[PDB]
Design an enzyme around this catalytic site. Structure first.
Site, PDB file in Angstrom:
ATOM      1  N   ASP A   1      -1.562   5.525  -5.456  1.00 23.61           N
ATOM      2  CA  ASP A   1      -1.857   4.745  -4.557  1.00 23.61           C
ATOM      3  C   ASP A   1      -2.252   3.376  -4.910  1.00 23.61           C
ATOM      4  O   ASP A   1      -3.385   2.973  -5.555  1.00 23.61           O
ATOM      5  CB  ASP A   1      -3.155   5.181  -3.730  1.00 23.61           C
ATOM      6  CG  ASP A   1      -3.713   4.514  -2.652  1.00 23.61           C
ATOM      7  OD1 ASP A   1      -2.817   3.458  -2.143  1.00 23.61           O
ATOM      8  OD2 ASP A   1      -4.823   4.858  -1.946  1.00 23.61           O
TER       9      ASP A   1
ATOM     10  N   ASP B   1       0.804  -1.283   0.001  1.00 24.89           N
ATOM     11  CA  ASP B   1      -0.046  -0.180   0.060  1.00 24.89           C
ATOM     12  C   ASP B   1       0.826   1.289  -0.207  1.00 24.89           C
ATOM     13  O   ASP B   1       1.338   1.667   1.050  1.00 24.89           O
ATOM     14  CB  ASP B   1      -0.826  -0.069   1.246  1.00 24.89           C
ATOM     15  CG  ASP B   1      -2.028   1.058   1.376  1.00 24.89           C
ATOM     16  OD1 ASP B   1      -2.088   1.855   0.350  1.00 24.89           O
ATOM     17  OD2 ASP B   1      -2.856   1.148   2.403  1.00 24.89           O
TER      18      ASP B   1
HETATM   19  C1  LIG Z   1      -7.347   3.694  -0.268  1.00 25.42           C
HETATM   20  N1  LIG Z   1      -6.834   3.196   1.116  1.00 25.42           N
HETATM   21  C2  LIG Z   1      -5.592   2.700   1.247  1.00 25.42           C
HETATM   22  N2  LIG Z   1      -4.959   3.027   0.330  1.00 25.42           N
HETATM   23  N3  LIG Z   1      -5.164   1.930   2.340  1.00 25.42           N
HETATM   24  C3  LIG Z   1      -5.839   1.386   3.424  1.00 25.42           C
HETATM   25  C4  LIG Z   1      -6.454   0.274   2.982  1.00 25.42           C
HETATM   26  C5  LIG Z   1      -6.548  -0.514   1.743  1.00 25.42           C
HETATM   27  C6  LIG Z   1      -7.083  -1.840   1.701  1.00 25.42           C
HETATM   28  C7  LIG Z   1      -7.328  -2.581   0.597  1.00 25.42           C
HETATM   29  C8  LIG Z   1      -8.030  -3.720   0.578  1.00 25.42           C
HETATM   30  C9  LIG Z   1      -8.316  -4.370  -0.586  1.00 25.42           C
HETATM   31  C10 LIG Z   1      -8.013  -3.864  -1.664  1.00 25.42           C
HETATM   32  C11 LIG Z   1      -7.239  -2.793  -2.006  1.00 25.42           C
HETATM   33  C12 LIG Z   1      -7.027  -2.554  -3.073  1.00 25.42           C
HETATM   34  N4  LIG Z   1      -6.404  -1.736  -4.133  1.00 25.42           N
HETATM   35  C13 LIG Z   1      -6.902  -2.054  -0.669  1.00 25.42           C
HETATM   36  C14 LIG Z   1      -7.368  -2.081   3.118  1.00 25.42           C
HETATM   37  S1  LIG Z   1      -7.030  -0.903   4.080  1.00 25.42           S
HETATM   38  C15 LIG Z   1      -5.349   1.817   4.608  1.00 25.42           C
HETATM   39  N5  LIG Z   1      -5.555   2.927   4.992  1.00 25.42           N
HETATM   40  C16 LIG Z   1      -5.205   3.736   6.052  1.00 25.42           C
HETATM   41  N6  LIG Z   1      -5.516   5.060   6.224  1.00 25.42           N
HETATM   42  C17 LIG Z   1      -4.771   5.591   7.102  1.00 25.42           C
HETATM   43  C18 LIG Z   1      -3.888   5.146   8.047  1.00 25.42           C
HETATM   44  F1  LIG Z   1      -3.184   5.756   8.893  1.00 25.42           F
HETATM   45  C19 LIG Z   1      -3.706   3.828   7.785  1.00 25.42           C
HETATM   46  N7  LIG Z   1      -3.984   3.023   6.927  1.00 25.42           N
HETATM   47  C20 LIG Z   1      -6.703   3.716   3.985  1.00 25.42           C
HETATM   48  C21 LIG Z   1      -7.279   2.443   3.477  1.00 25.42           C
HETATM   49  C22 LIG Z   1      -7.756   2.955   2.092  1.00 25.42           C
HETATM   50  O1  LIG Z   1      -8.828   3.207   2.070  1.00 25.42           O
END
Ligand SMILES: CN1C(=N)N[C@@]2(c3cc(-c4cccc(C#N)c4)cs3)CN(c3ncc(F)cn3)C[C@H]2C1=O
Length: 387
Positions: free
Chosen positions: A232, A36
């Site tokens: 991202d 990520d």
């Molecule tokens: C868009 N996005 C991310 N890039 N990461 C996060 C995640 C992404 C996924 C996920 C699951 C399945 C498919 C995909 C794809 N492509 C991505 C699960 S959790 C993490 N996040 C976050 N924010 C603030 C923080 F201090 C820590 N972590 C935000 C989540 C998110 O909605």
């Protein structure tokens, strides 16, 4: 150069994310970890969950160190909570190094783990600024660079198959490469073009022009970066600010007007199907994003095809897709739709992101994804949003 031990070390697909194998603890505990670039915490399942068949067992690791501190990470689609600690971490198909890194041991979660997904944790590759609880929690890549001689750079080649992968196929298929500490020339064709990292928090960039089949969207360029534009790997879609999304969809509908699609298709809810092999790629336009160049008044463009922004989904022998361009209220997100077309270089050492045509992008005999330049573009700093 050539990093054969790291080529083809990813698995997954845009809808479920792409993951790399890692080991945590002594003796090593193997886990699959979501890559990520949109977050900065290394967090793993550390308690039983119905969607996990393995998790980090801290009591079985002799090198586990308790930080005696909790971490709560709520986000839009879900949340995770855990306990902070450190342990020895390695990447089997990676650099041949072991590092002592922070690990958030997830004990409670809501809509984080996915049934059918084969990953047990997340690797946040962005900067300390957005780490939780705060920026004092050193991210994994920062630890890796500090403790070893690994260069401060990584590169990603996310490979979309161009067709749906079933439960067994997605486990056996190569999803791409994460090259830690270098650039592998076999993963791209043509030249690499670099855009500055605007600020080190997310991997923030500046878009200066948008075209749909060569037609300028003609919006004030600030709109394209309202309130930020990021790269991202943890977002499936290309997400655009509300006003940009509205203009883009109108233009994409106009270009593809020989075929009418229901409103649900454009909202990303409903699939569209065609008889096997008959997807009318040619009616859909290419999309170009111009990015600020490294040279003053210079830009370059990246161009994707409908083979990137129409995500293959299973329905039958029909070829079905969902529209993978969607609205955002938090700025542009260049997710797997963009990333599957290109080899992306996260050059942290030189504060820049490189793009080249991916050797694994899906295309047809008539059109290909492209990375081209230079173009003369004035007042590009004006495209960046402030406040
Ligand atoms: C868009 N996005 C991310 N890039 N990461 C996060 C995640 C992404 C996924 C996920 C699951 C399945 C498919 C995909 C794809 N492509 C991505 C699960 S959790 C993490 N996040 C976050 N924010 C603030 C923080 F201090 C820590 N972590 C935000 C989540 C998110 O909605």
């Amino acid at each position: 150069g050539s990093f054969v031990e790291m080529v083809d070390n990813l698995r997954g697909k845009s809808g479920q994310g792409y993951y790399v194998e890692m080991t945590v603890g002594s003796p090593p505990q193997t886990l699959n970890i979501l890559v990520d670039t949109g977050s900065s915490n290394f967090a793993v399942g550390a308690a039983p969950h119905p969607f996990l068949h393995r998790y980090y067992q801290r009591q079985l690791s002799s090198t586990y160190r308790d930080l005696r501190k909790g971490v709560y990470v709520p986000y839009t689609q879900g949340k995770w909570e855990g306990e902070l600690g450190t342990d020895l971490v390695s990447i089997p198909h990676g650099p041949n190094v072991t590092v002592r890194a922070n690990i958030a041991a997830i004990t409670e979660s809501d809509k984080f783990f996915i049934n059918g997904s084969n990953w047990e944790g997340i690797l946040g590759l962005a900067y300390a600024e957005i780490a939780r609880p705060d920026d004092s929690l050193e991210p994994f890549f920062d630890s890796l660079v500090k403790q070893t001689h690994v260069p401060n750079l990584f590169s990603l080649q996310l490979c979309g198959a161009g067709f749906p992968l079933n439960q067994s196929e997605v486990l056996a298929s190569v999803g791409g490469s994460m090259i830690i500490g270098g650039i592998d020339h076999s993963l791209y064709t043509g030249s690499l073009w670099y855009t500055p990292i605007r600020r080190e928090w997310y991997y923030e960039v500046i878009i200066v022009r948008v075209e749909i089949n060569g037609q300028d969207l003609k919006m004030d360029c600030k709109e394209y970066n309202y309130d930020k534009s990021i790269v991202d790997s943890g977002t499936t879609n290309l997400r655009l600010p509300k006003k940009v999304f509205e203009a883009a969809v109108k233009s994409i509908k106009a270009a593809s007007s020989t075929e009418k699609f229901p409103d649900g298709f454009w909202l990303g809810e409903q699939l569209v199907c065609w008889q096997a092999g008959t997807t009318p790629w040619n009616i859909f336009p290419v999309i170009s994003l111009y990015l600020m160049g490294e040279v003053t008044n210079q830009s370059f463009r990246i161009t994707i095809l409908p083979q990137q922004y129409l995500r293959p989904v299973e329905d039958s022998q029909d070829d079905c897709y969902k529209f993978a361009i969607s609205q955002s209220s938090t700025g542009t997100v260049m997710g797997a739709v963009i990333m599957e077309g290109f080899y992306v270089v996260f050059d942290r050492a030189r504060k820049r992101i490189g793009f080249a045509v991916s050797a694994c992008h899906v295309h047809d005999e008539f059109r290909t994804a492209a990375v081209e330049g230079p173009f003369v573009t004035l007042d590009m700093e004006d495209c960046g949003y402030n406040i």
